[PDB]
Design a protein around this ligand. Structure first.
Ligand code: BCL
Ligand code: BCL
Ligand code: BCL
Ligand code: BCL
Ligand code: BCL
Ligand code: BCL
Ligand code: BCL
Ligand code: BCL
Ligand code: BCL
Ligand code: HEM
Ligand SMILES: [Fe+3]
Lengths: 49, 300, 32, 47, 107, 38, 306, 38, 38, 38, 38, 38, 49, 49, 38, 49, 38, 38, 38, 38
């Protein structure tokens, strides 16, 4: 686990850090797409009124 | 020398002493470990009458049985003139009477018969607990019998008091408590659609299937040269799983209790809170996941 | 009253359910 | 007039008496076999 | 009979405070029935819905009869034991099974 | 000895008591004697 | 002459699959065994699997056709869809439209083939291991009841409409309709006999389980070893049931009792259901002539009205 | 000795008590004596 | 000694309590004394 | 070898028989060929 | 010997008794003889 | 050998019997031949 | 297996050859009877029409 | 199994040959009776028409 | 030997008795003979 | 099994021969009685018509 | 030998008996021969 | 090797057969092509 | 370590899929957006 | 390694197939595209 930073060594293995990075990047991209979609949907038809 | 095996087979040629049944009974029969022996310091009846054990709860139970049988036969031969057991009609008091009893009015002997039957059942349960304590055993048989006794108690005590009329009790007549069952099932129409009745039916069917499979499994390896692993290999080729020697009995016990428990819950709930099991399911088509998704005869 | 006694009988009905849950808990716990 | 029809006789009571007698006979024979003497572990030393 | 009462039909009996737009068979009362089902007013009602021990019908006719019977249950709100003795359905005992016949003929 | 004395006594007494109870109930339920309010 | 190791780890047809066993964990803690092990697939179990798959596929596709192929209405109404048999008109005929009972017949036929091949699989696998063939005959009794319900009752009545309708809700409806159409099903004597045997089966199962679990400290659950020399647990159980009700069995006869109770339940149910339609058209009207119906002149009807 | 003294005493007392209770209830419910409000 | 003193005391006390309860409930339910609202 | 000969034979024969039966039933229930009384 | 004497006696006696009872009841319920009040 | 002779014989006989019964039942139930009262 | 022909020796036992012959003869007889029955049924009432 | 013919020695025991003979005679008698009964039934009332 | 004598005797006797009962019942229920009140 | 004939020695014990004789005689008597009963019933009321 | 003689005999006898019973019932229930009251 | 060849073959063949059957049934039931009597 | 990485991944992904399907179905059935034929 | 490759591929393929099927049935059943007879 020599690639894990010092703070998170007692929790993360060396193979799980890469998967965690992939998951974090995927979640951030999904959040960006979701905010864009919600803005477009509100511009189309407001659901609050 | 021929040794008779417990299965009844005799084989030519370990602690396999062929011993009578008297020695086993004499070794294990010791006095003074029942429930009442702990409470009063002594069991008033701590003896055996033939093969039966007569404890403090055996006398109460026998009194209850005798009184119940006498009161049952009095109402059905006298006060009805039927003279046949298949056409007598032992009914509780009318619903207009309320929760109070009256010796002058009809339906009085139904009350005494029901009370005596309840006393006898409770005494039987306590006597089983006593006998289980005397043998250093577990308390599982009393648990099962208590489940069925609670099933009895729900129908004749709790439901009538909750409804509040005391005429809400099934008559104690052969081929006539079926009449009460049929009329109660149709007043709350589609008793099939009661969710807890279906669970009871499912557990009953599973109990029958499990019992028959266990009997077949045990009988199939009775009197052959087997390595004690053949039945597991059979049960793993078919169905791809074997449960083990101790797992099956636990399953049987648990299912047998659960079926009657769910049935008593369903009957009690049908008595008081719901009036129509068809209207109970009216919420399914109205949840906010399917409301506007259909058209014509297909929309609800 | 109409509802208090009914709720009490409901409690009594569930007290019947409890003993078998006790056996399940004993079987689960006592193995280890 | 007061008698049940023949179907009521046979279909209902032949099975009933058959069930009662068969139960009472099976109980007797099973108790006989269970009370018969055969190989048992000695209770004095087994436990 | 007079035991039912002297109640008589009037304008508010059907219209119930609505001039037009009166609707029989709303969505509320069509709970466990097909939504296209209607009361079968093509038959002869003194003996129209008899199914018990017929040997010329099957579960299809019994299903139609059960739909009609559940509609009757919902319309009155008294359950299936209001007009029947569940030990024998063809029986004429409870005395509201005849009033229902007069209602069927009137409808 | 084919039959022990104790079982003979028990069976005879039980049968006698059962028959006595049954006969009294059958006679009382017949309503042909005017006994206990006719 | 029978090797248990090859019976579990052969390969291909007349062999097993999922050979490396899996462990469930929680089943070990609660039931005592958690190994899933390999499963046999040779010959029998292939035909049955294929036929059951075909029948289920037909039923599910006909479910899909009834809602316009909408997957949301499918989920909403999945528990009350059913494929019904042909109506009473020209009932026994097979020249029915696919949406008026055409899909029911093929699925029923495939189900019949599936159950028969499953019985054959049970028989052959019981023979191949050295154990007896009691399970095959018990399943034969169950199949007797099944075939009375699905094949032999519709036939001899003249129409396919007398059979169930292949649905979650369509079997309860079938039971209710069959009870209503032939008078009162409570007064059918074989129904009473079957109820007797079913309740006895449940009672016996509960008693046997409770006893074997109560005397489990002395290893009474090893029934195969108890059938050679009886240890203290079986003696304690025998004494318990002797002192309670005056008579008892041993570790061998109780299984005979259970087997025969189940078999009698199935057989009596089948006989009663078959007689329900062909010989006696009205069970209540027959019970009145047989003197088993109690007179009810003046019932108190306030109990049954809201 | 065929029968213990204790068994005889217990059986006789139980039978007597059961008979007394049954007879009192049967006479009370017959309404033929005018006792306890007719 | 055929019967322990403790057994006799227990049986007598149980019978007395049960019968006293039974007589009180039976007299109360008969409605012939004008007690506890008639 | 990936597959036995017997497995292939069994699977192919079963599939063929099932498809033949299904096709015959579907064509019979369509009523478009005027076969077996139209 | 294919069959015990005892089993033959038991089966024959049971069959005869059942047949006699069944025939008597079937004749009695027919009302074709005028026996026991027509 | 891929298949036993016994397995082939049993499978073929069962299939033939089932097919014969099915074909007879479908031909009879169609009512297009005037056999056994039309 | 000396009665089996050379080509089918690895498949057939000596006792199964006779049963196979019996089955073949029965099948051919049944086929002839089926052909006759079918032609008679067609001469009676055509089913294709 | 000295009574069985030479052909059927691999299939038949010595006690089963007699039983098979009895069975074949019974089958032939039953077939003759069935043919006669069918002819009489047809002469009474034809079922084909 | 393929079949025991006892099995053959049992099967034949059971089949015969079942058939005798069945044909007497079927002949009775038809009402085509006028026996036992028509 | 010295009482059984030569042909049926492989099939019969010495005790089963007598029982078989008894059963055969009973069957023949029953057949004669049944034939007489059928003749009487047909003379009474023909069932075919 | 692929099949026992006893197995063949049992299977053939059972099939024959079942077929005979089924055919007799099917012919009787059709009402096309005027046998046993038409 | 992450996957056996036989598992891949079985899964692919089963999926293809199921998809073909489903597509044929859906297209037949749509009533848009005029196949098998419209 | 309190929680495996695999467990958290599985729970979070399953929750996301279920919530997404639920939210699309609730938005589609509300009829407020004019999507897929109003 | 937190996840096997085969588990991931199986889960992804099954999810993709289910989603594609669901989307095609949803688009077909809405009747907003005029496909397969409107
Ligand atoms: C109502 C008005 C709009 C609308 C409004 C919105 C809005 C607003 C949003 C979406 C979003 C999305 N919509 Mg929408 N949507 C509409 C109609 C549609 C239609 C259609 C047929 O018309 C489709 C196909 C979709 C589909 C989609 C998705 C692309 C997306 C949600 C993804 C998801 O499930 O995340 C949840 C899924 C998961 C948690 C599972 C992920 C699985 C991963 C990627 C695969 C892993 C495989 C591997 C083996 C796993 C290993 C670990 C395992 C545990 C072993 N919408 C209409 C037209 N939609 C959202 C979005 O943009 O998301 C990015 C969003 O915010
Ligand atoms: C219907 C017109 C007549 C009438 C017509 C007849 C005729 C006709 C006869 C009788 C007969 C009898 N009737 Mg009457 N009967 C009438 C009204 C009555 C009434 C009544 C309440 O009105 C009663 C109580 C009786 C009573 C009796 C019995 C005295 C007797 C049958 C005995 C019996 O049970 O034999 C059956 C009993 C047994 C086989 C067993 C008896 C018990 C044994 C002796 C006890 C042994 C105990 C020992 C421990 C056992 C060892 C073995 C154990 C298993 C361990 N009758 C009316 C008035 N009655 C019959 C008779 O006279 O018999 C002599 C007779 O034939
Ligand atoms: C009122 C008129 C009623 C009627 C009402 C009753 C009632 C009520 C009873 C009887 C009882 C009996 N009846 Mg009367 N009986 C009637 C007509 C009859 C006829 C008839 C042919 O006409 C007969 C033959 C009988 C016959 C009998 C006997 C079976 C019995 C009394 C004798 C006995 O056993 O004493 C033996 C009895 C004893 C030895 C009891 C001794 C008890 C001791 C004294 C202690 C009592 C309890 C004590 C106070 C408790 C507190 C102290 C503590 C113990 C320390 N009755 C009419 C119809 N009959 C009584 C009986 O005992 O039934 C079982 C009974 O209860
Ligand atoms: C109201 C008029 C009612 C009626 C109402 C009752 C009621 C109510 C009861 C009786 C009881 C009895 N009735 Mg009265 N009874 C009526 C008419 C009759 C007739 C009749 C033919 O008319 C008869 C024969 C009887 C006969 C009897 C006796 C069996 C008994 C009383 C004597 C006894 O044994 O005392 C023996 C009793 C004792 C020695 C008890 C001693 C208890 C000690 C003193 C302790 C008491 C508890 C104490 C206060 C607790 C707190 C302190 C702590 C202990 C430290 N009754 C009428 C119909 N009767 C009573 C009884 O005891 O029944 C079993 C009873 O409860
Ligand atoms: C419908 C017009 C006629 C009629 C038409 C006919 C005709 C026609 C015939 C009969 C026949 C008979 N009928 Mg009829 N029958 C009528 C009315 C009746 C009435 C009546 C109450 O009126 C009765 C009692 C009978 C009775 C009889 C029998 C005597 C006989 C059938 C015997 C049998 O069971 O064979 C089957 C029995 C067995 C297979 C076994 C019987 C028992 C054996 C002998 C005992 C062995 C015991 C030993 C221990 C067993 C060892 C092996 C065990 C396995 C251990 N019929 C009416 C009046 N009936 C038949 C006959 O004459 O037969 C000779 C016959 O063909
Ligand atoms: C009446 C006209 C009907 C019709 C009615 C029937 C009926 C009815 C049957 C067939 C059967 C068959 N039909 Mg056709 N059939 C029709 C039109 C067709 C058409 C067509 C496209 O038009 C075709 C292709 C077929 C094709 C077929 C074959 C699959 C089969 C006959 C050959 C066979 O396999 O023999 C192989 C079969 C054998 C060799 C059997 C051998 C049996 C041996 C000889 C023993 C017989 C039993 C014996 C007597 C029992 C007693 C003795 C004891 C055994 C000791 N039919 C029309 C619609 N068809 C028959 C069949 O076998 O279906 C499975 C069948 O039962
Ligand atoms: C339930 C039946 C009884 C029984 C009842 C009888 C009877 C009854 C008789 C015998 C006789 C015999 N039994 Mg024994 N027997 C039983 C058990 C056994 C057992 C055994 C279980 O081990 C054995 C080995 C035997 C063996 C024997 C022989 C020792 C003996 C002579 C047989 C013979 O030659 O028959 C060969 C002859 C026949 C088989 C005759 C068959 C007749 C057929 C049935 C036709 C009858 C026509 C009818 C009478 C005419 C009717 C006219 C009407 C008016 C219409 N029985 C069982 C328990 N047994 C007989 C005997 O000892 O005679 C001196 C005798 O009478
Ligand atoms: C009435 C005209 C009816 C009809 C009514 C019947 C009836 C009824 C039956 C048959 C049966 C058969 N039918 Mg036809 N059948 C009709 C038209 C047809 C047609 C046609 C295309 O039209 C065909 C092909 C057939 C073909 C057949 C055969 C499958 C079979 C007869 C041959 C056989 O196997 O004998 C072989 C049979 C045997 C070898 C039996 C031998 C039995 C021995 C002799 C013992 C008999 C019992 C004995 C008396 C018991 C007492 C003694 C004790 C045992 C000691 N039927 C029409 C529709 N058919 C019969 C059959 O056996 O079906 C299975 C049958 O029962
Ligand atoms: C017609 C217009 C419809 C519509 C109809 C459809 C249909 C129909 C489908 C989609 C699918 C999808 N839709 Mg769209 N969709 C609409 C509006 C939207 C909106 C929107 C907000 O408006 C969004 C965000 C989406 C989003 C999406 C995605 C979730 C997805 C396509 C991307 C993907 O995952 O590719 C990844 C896809 C792949 C990598 C597939 C690879 C397949 C390989 C090539 C093999 C295919 C099988 C092969 C031919 C088999 C035979 C050979 C053998 C293998 C040997 N849709 C409207 C309402 N949409 C598609 C999908 O995949 O859903 C799960 C789909 O099926
Ligand atoms: C009372 C005697 C009575 C009156 C008054 C009345 C009026 C009435 C009107 C004016 C209409 C038509 C109004 C419009 O244009 O639709 C109308 C229509 C219906 N009615 Fe009616 N009506 C009276 C009595 C009754 C009674 C007693 C019934 C019930 C049996 C009844 C029923 C109906 C129905 C149904 C209609 C159809 C109206 C609809 O919206 O479809 N009326 N009535
Ligand atoms: Fe067991």
């Amino acid at each position: 686990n020599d690639l894990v930073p010092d703070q998170w060594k007692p929790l993360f293995n060396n193979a799980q850090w890469l998967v965690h990075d992939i998951v974090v990047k995927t979640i951030y991209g999904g959040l960006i797409i979701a905010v864009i979609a919600h803005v477009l949907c509100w511009a189309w038809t407001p659901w609050i009124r | 020398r021929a040794l008779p095996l417990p299965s009844g087979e005799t084989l030519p040629a370990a602690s396999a002493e062929v011993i009578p049944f008297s020695i086993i009974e004499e070794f294990y029969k010791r006095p003074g470990k029942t429930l009442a022996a702990r409470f009063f310091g002594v069991d008033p009846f701590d003896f055996w009458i033939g093969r039966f054990y007569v404890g403090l709860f055996g006398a109460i139970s026998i009194i209850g049985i005798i009184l119940g049988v006498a009161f049952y036969l009095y109402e059905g031969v006298v006060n009805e003139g039927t003279l046949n057991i298949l056409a007598m009609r032992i009914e509780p008091p009318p619903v207009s009477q309320g929760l109070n009893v009256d010796p002058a009015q009809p339906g009085f002997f139904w009350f005494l018969t029901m009370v005596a039957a309840t006393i006898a059942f409770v005494g039987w349960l306590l006597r089983q607990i006593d006998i289980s304590l005397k043998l250093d055993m577990g308390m599982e048989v009393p648990i099962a019998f208590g489940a069925v006794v609670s099933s009895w108690i729900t129908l004749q005590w709790l439901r009538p008091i909750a409804m509040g009329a005391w005429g809400h009790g099934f008559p104690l007549g052969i081929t006539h408590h079926l009449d009460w069952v049929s009329n109660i099932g149709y007043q709350y129409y589609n008793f099939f659609y009661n969710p807890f009745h279906a669970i009871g039916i499912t557990l009953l069917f599973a109990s029958t299937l499990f019992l028959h499979m266990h009997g077949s499994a045990v009988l199939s390896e009775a009197k052959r040269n087997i390595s004690d692993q053949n039945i597991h290999v059979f049960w793993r080729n078919i169905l791809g799983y074997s449960i083990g020697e101790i797992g099956i009995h636990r399953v049987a016990f648990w299912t047998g209790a659960a079926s009657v428990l769910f049935s008593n819950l369903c009957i009690f709930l049908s008595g008081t809170f719901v009036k129509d099991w068809n209207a109970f399911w009216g919420f399914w088509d109205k949840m906010p996941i399917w409301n506007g998704v259909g058209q014509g005869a297909l929309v609800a | 009253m109409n509802w208090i006694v009914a709720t009490f009988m409901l409690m009594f009905v569930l007290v019947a359910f409890l003993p078998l849950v006790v056996s399940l808990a004993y079987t689960w716990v006592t193995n280890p | 007039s007061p008698w049940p029809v023949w179907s009521g006789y046979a279909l209902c009571f032949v099975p009933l008496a058959a069930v009662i007698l068969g139960f009472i006979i099976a109980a007797r024979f099973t108790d006989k076999q269970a009370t018969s003497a055969y190989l048992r572990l000695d209770p004095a030393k087994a436990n | 009979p007079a035991s039912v009462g002297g109640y008589q039909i009037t304008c508010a009996t059907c219209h119930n405070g609505k001039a037009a737009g009166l609707e029989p068979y709303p969505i509320e009362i069509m709970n466990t029935l097909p939504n296209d089902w209607r009361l079968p007013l093509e038959l002869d009602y003194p003996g129209g819905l008899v199914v018990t021990g017929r040997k010329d019908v099957s579960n299809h006719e019994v299903e139609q009869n059960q739909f009609a019977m559940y509609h009757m249950n919902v319309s009155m709100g008294q359950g299936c034991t209001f007009c029947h003795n569940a030990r024998y359905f063809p029986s004429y005992e409870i005395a509201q099974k005849n009033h229902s016949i007069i209602m069927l003929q009137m409808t | 000895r084919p039959f022990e004395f104790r079982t003979s006594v028990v069976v005879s007494t039980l049968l006698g008591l059962v028959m006595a109870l049954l006969i009294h109930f059958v006679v009382l339920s017949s309503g042909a004697f005017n006994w206990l309010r006719a | 002459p029978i090797d248990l190791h090859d019976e579990e780890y052969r390969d291909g047809l007349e062999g097993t699959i999922a050979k490396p066993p899996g462990h469930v964990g929680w089943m070990q803690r609660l039931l005592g065994e958690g190994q899933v092990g390999p499963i046999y697939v040779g010959l029998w179990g292939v035909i049955s699997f294929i036929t059951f798959f075909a029948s289920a596929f037909i039923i599910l596709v006909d479910y899909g056709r009834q809602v316009g192929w909408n997957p949301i209405i499918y989920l909403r109404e999945f528990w009350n869809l059913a494929v019904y048999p042909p109506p009473t008109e020209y009932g026994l005929s097979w020249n029915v439209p696919w949406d008026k009972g055409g899909a029911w017949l093929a699925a029923t036929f495939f189900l019949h083939i599936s159950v028969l091949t499953w019985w054959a699989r049970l028989y052959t696998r019981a023979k191949a291991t050295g154990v007896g063939t009691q399970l095959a005959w018990g399943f034969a009794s169950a199949l007797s009841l099944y075939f009375v319900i699905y094949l032999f009752h519709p036939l001899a009545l003249g129409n396919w409409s007398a059979a169930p309708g292949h649905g979650f809700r369509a079997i309860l409806d079938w039971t209710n309709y069959v009870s209503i159409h032939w008078g009162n099903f409570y007064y059918n004597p074989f129904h009473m006999l079957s109820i007797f045997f079913l309740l006895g089966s449940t009672l016996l199962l509960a008693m046997h389980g409770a006893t074997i679990v109560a005397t489990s400290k002395w290893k009474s659950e090893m029934e195969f070893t108890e059938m050679m020399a009886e240890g203290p647990g079986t003696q304690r159980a025998q004494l318990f049931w002797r002192w309670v009700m005056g008579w008892n069995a041993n570790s061998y006869n109780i299984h005979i009792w259970a087997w025969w109770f189940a078999a009698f339940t199935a057989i009596t149910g089948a006989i009663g259901l078959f007689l329900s339609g062909t010989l006696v058209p009205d069970w209540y009207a027959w019970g009145e002539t047989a003197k088993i119906v109690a007179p009810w002149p003046n019932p108190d009807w306030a109990q049954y009205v809201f």
